[PDB]
Structures are given as C-alpha cells and as structure tokens.
C-alpha cells in the first residue's frame, strides 16, 4: 500500500513505450541507492477518485507477488498525476515479439516461454489467486529467453463455464493458459480468427477445439487438449503442467 510511495523527483519520465487501459505507459529512470530503468503507467482521468481506485488496484494486486516471471511493482505516486512504477520489460508485448520474429525463434524458445508462464501460474495457484485473463497480449518480454506475466470481453480465451456463468476458477485459468500456449506456437496469431464471439460457445460445446499448430510437438498439443476438457475437474493443475512442459523442453533441447 503506502510503504511503496515514491516521491516524483526520484522519477525521470522517458519515451512512450505503449498504451494501457488508463493512459500511456512510459520508459523511465528511478534514482535511489543505483538509477534503474522502469515502466511508468500513467492515468489521464485519475483526478476522479473512482478511476484512481480502479487504476491503483493493479498496484494493490501486484504488491502481493514476488516471482521471476511476474512483472515486479517498484512503487506508486498517489499525488496527481497518479503513476504506477514497474519493472521494465524492454522487448514489449509477447504477441508483437512472436509475430516480428516468426522466422527468428525456434521451437525450444517457444516451449521455454510456455514453461516460464506455467511457473508464474503455478506460483499464483499456490497463492490461490485466479488471474481471469491469461493471453499472449498480457505477457511481456524482458529478454529473448525471459518472459513475464504483466496484467493485473475475451470470449475466444474463456473456459465454457466463464462464458456461460461468469465462473472464474483455477480450472478456468488452465483453459486460458492452453489458449495462450496455442497463441505462442502459432507465432502470435489470435485464436478463432474470423469467428464471432457469440458463436464460440456453440463450437466449444460441439467438441470443437483449436487445431494442432504447425511444427507443434504432438505431446505439447496433447497437453493443450487436456487444458480444454469441458469438465473443469478433468483439467490438470499448473504443478503438473510445469512438470510436463519441463520434460517437453528437454525433449526439444536435445533433438
Ligand atoms: C509494466 C509494463 N507495462 N508495459 C511494459 C514494458 N515493460 N514493462 C512494462
């Protein structure tokens, strides 16, 4: 909460590195004893307390976590203009990174990002925290072998129970991770491209699933289809996913 208060003069604003829900995201420097590279989330309408509460809720959420593959909260500036200071992931959005590098990223690197993500999600499951929005767009790239989970209606990523009843559980997070894994092996291509959101549920309920991505190991696809069990109680947990992705990665790093 308040132990994360940073005074503004300890922050040098830099160039705009993208956009967020509340305002522009900036690169910048945080000076305090060694002047570190950071991401400054801004909020244009934060003069209104209802917006301010919603915006600073991400800071409140992220304070609770400490993991190598979850974006770190550095601090907050509660006075106007309200800012959220975070760890900078220089390579940006995963979706864009995967697209740009479609012919410059091997299978091993793709499986590695899936593995890394499963470790952040196993950690969140251990804290009994439900993410509700696991998708490639919410993953950031720190380096070419280090991705981070960054965000704290996506019908095409949602488990049927989330669509039908707005139920969000650890099981529904596993479904979304399966979709995210598919997005990674499909080089940032969006799931169900061409299908209307309202027709997705009907396809799922007819047993229809996202196809095997080209060059995807059938063992990795078998893991994804397990995430897409209609019955949430039949889906694996992140602990098992992490362990299986770990073995799949070695099965690739060798041959
Ligand atoms: C946080 C955050 N949002 N966008 C970013 C790029 N690097 N770090 C971040």
Residues 19 and 61 both lie in one domain: yes
Span from the CA of 23 to the centroid of ligand 1 (angstroms): 13
> Token digits for 187?
């080089």
Residues 102 and 205 both lie in one domain: yes
Q: Tell me the structure's resolution in angstroms, rounded to a single decimal.
A: 2.7
Residue 47: exposed, middle, or buried by beta-carbon count in 10 A (0-12, 13-18, 19+)?
exposed
Q: What is the DSSP letter of 63?
A: H
Query: How far is 175 from 236, CA to CA, in rounded Å?
Result: 9
Decide which of 88, 123, 148 is a domain's last residue. 88
Residues belonging to the chain: 255
17 a known binding residue?
Answer: yes
The span from the first CA to the last CA of the chain, in angstroms, equals 48
Query: How far is 106 from 104, CA to CA, in rounded Å?
Result: 7
Q: Is the peptide bond before 81 cis (omega within 30 degrees of 0)?
A: yes
Residues 13 and 103 both lie in one domain: no
Residues 45 and 151 both lie in one domain: no
User: Which residues does a 6 A CB cutoff place in the pocket of ligand 1?
Assistant: 17-18, 25, 39, 71, 86, 88-89, 92, 140, 150
CATH of the domain at 3: 3.30.200.20
Residues 97 and 73 both lie in one domain: no
Contact criterion met (CB below 8 Å) for 29 and 37: yes
Q: What is the DSSP letter of 140?
A: E
Residues 239 and 188 both lie in one domain: yes
Residues 84 and 98 both lie in one domain: no
87 a known binding residue?
Answer: yes
CATH of the domain at 192: 1.10.510.10
- Give the count of domains, the chain: 2
Span from the CA of 169 to the centroid of ligand 1 (angstroms): 26
Q: What amino acid positions are annotated as catalytic residues?
A: 133
> Token digits for 169?
């559980």
> Token digits for 24?
């522009």
Strand positions, DSSP E, 111-244? 139-143, 146-149
Which range marks the domain in which residue 81 is found?
1-88
Query: How far is 40 from 76, CA to CA, in rounded Å?
Result: 9
- Tally Cβ neighbours within 10 Å of residue 205: 12
Span from the CA of 218 to the centroid of ligand 1 (angstroms): 33
Facing residues of 149 across strands?
70, 139
């Amino acid at each position: 909460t308040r132990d994360y208060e940073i005074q503004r003069e300890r922050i040098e604003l830099g160039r705009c590195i993208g956009e967020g829900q509340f305002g522009d995201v900036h690169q910048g420097i945080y000076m305090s004893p060694p002047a570190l590279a950071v991401a400054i989330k801004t909020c244009k309408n934060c003069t209104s307390d209802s917006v301010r509460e919603k915006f600073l809720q991400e800071a409140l959420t992220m304070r609770q976590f400490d993991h190598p593959h979850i974006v770190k909260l550095i601090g907050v500036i509660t006075e106007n203009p309200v800012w959220i200071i975070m760890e900078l992931c220089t390579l940006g959005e995963l979706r864009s990174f995967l697209q740009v590098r479609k012919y410059s990223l091997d299978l091993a690197s793709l499986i590695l990002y899936a593995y890394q993500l499963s470790t952040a999600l196993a950690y969140l499951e251990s804290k009994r925290f439900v993410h509700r929005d696991i998708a490639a767009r919410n993953v950031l790239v720190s380096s070419n072998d280090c991705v981070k989970l960054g965000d704290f209606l996506p019908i095409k990523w949602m488990a049927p129970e989330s669509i039908n009843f707005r139920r969000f559980t650890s099981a529904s997070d596993v479904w979304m991770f399966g979709v995210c894994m598919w997005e990674i092996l499909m080089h940032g291509v969006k799931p169900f491209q061409g299908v209307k959101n309202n027709d997705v549920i009907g396809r799922i309920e007819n047993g229809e699933r996202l196809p095997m991505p080209p060059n995807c190991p059938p063992t990795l696809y078998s893991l994804m289809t397990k995430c897409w069990a209609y019955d949430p109680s039949r889906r694996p947990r992140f602990t098992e996913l992490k362990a299986q992705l770990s073995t799949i990665l070695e099965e690739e790093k060798a041959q």
